[PDB]
Design an enzyme around this catalytic site. Sequence first.
Site, PDB file in Angstrom:
ATOM      1  N   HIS A 118       0.825  -1.231   0.000  1.00  0.00           N
ATOM      2  CA  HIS A 118       0.000   0.000   0.000  1.00  0.00           C
ATOM      3  C   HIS A 118       0.843   1.258   0.000  1.00  0.00           C
ATOM      4  CE1 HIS A 118      -0.052   0.340   4.576  1.00  0.00           C
ATOM      5  NE2 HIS A 118       0.042   1.607   4.225  1.00  0.00           N
TER       6      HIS A 118
ATOM      7  N   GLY B  95       2.378   6.412   8.822  1.00  0.00           N
ATOM      8  CA  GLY B  95       3.820   6.573   8.624  1.00  0.00           C
ATOM      9  C   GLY B  95       4.634   5.380   9.125  1.00  0.00           C
TER      10      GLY B  95
END
Lengths: 245, 14
Positions: free
Chosen positions: A46, A196
Site C-alpha cells: 500500500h 507513517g
Amino acid sequence: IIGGEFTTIENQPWFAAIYRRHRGGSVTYVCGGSLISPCWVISATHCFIDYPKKEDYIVYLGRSRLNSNTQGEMKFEVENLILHKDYSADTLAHHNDIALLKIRSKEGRCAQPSRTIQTIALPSMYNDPQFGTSCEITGFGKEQSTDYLYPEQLKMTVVKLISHRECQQPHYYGSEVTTKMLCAADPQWKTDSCQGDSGGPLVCSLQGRMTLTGIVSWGRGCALKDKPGVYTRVSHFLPWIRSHT
Amino acid sequence: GXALGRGCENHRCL
C-alpha cells in the site's frame, strides 16, 4: 508510534527508512521496512501502489533520524520494486499488503552488516507466537493523531498479540480481519503504530530468535479503544517471498 | 493523500 519510546538504530538494526523523491527535488518519508537479507527489504504494497515507480524511492539502513544523517548509515536505490499482485484495499482492511524492495547503492552494492545494520530472521511456516505474546514495532510514524509532521527521532513500542477470535468481535473488526493478518495492541490502548509506521516491522522473540512476525498494514485510527493495529502475517507469505527473492 | 490512518501513506487522493 503513539506512546512508546524514542530509540536508536543499534536497537533495531534491520529497520529501513523509505523515502520518495518528488519533482523539484523535495524528498518525503513514505514508510518503514525491514532488511531480510543484504539485498532485500520487505515492506507493504500500500505504501507504493499509487506511485509504483522504483526510481522515485530512496532507502536508508543504519538511520536513527528522519532528516539528519546518522554515523554508519548507508543509502540505497531500488533496483527492483515488487508489489503483491492480488493486493486490494477495502474501507479499512488491506489485503496481501506485502512488498519487496531489492536495494543497491550507487556502486551496485547491497547492505554491509555492521553494529547499526543487520538482517531480521523470517519466521518458519505457520509458526507464529501465542496470542498474548509481547512483540515490538518500530517506525517514524505520527506520535499523535493531531501531528502533521513525523518525529525526527526513531521510535519503538511494545504491543501484545491478539487472537483472531478477539479481533473478529463485532466491536473490534468483525470479519474484516482475516487469518492472513495479525492484530496487536496495548491492553490499555495507550500505545500503537500510526500513519507513517506502515511497512515497518512487528518483531517477536520466537524461540530465542528475533523474528519478523508482522508488517505494519492497517487499523481504524491509532491507539483507539477496541481497534488494534493489523499486521501482515509474514508466516503465510513465505512461498511468495521465496519465489520473488 | 488520505490522512485517515495506516493504509493511506503515499496515496493519490483526488
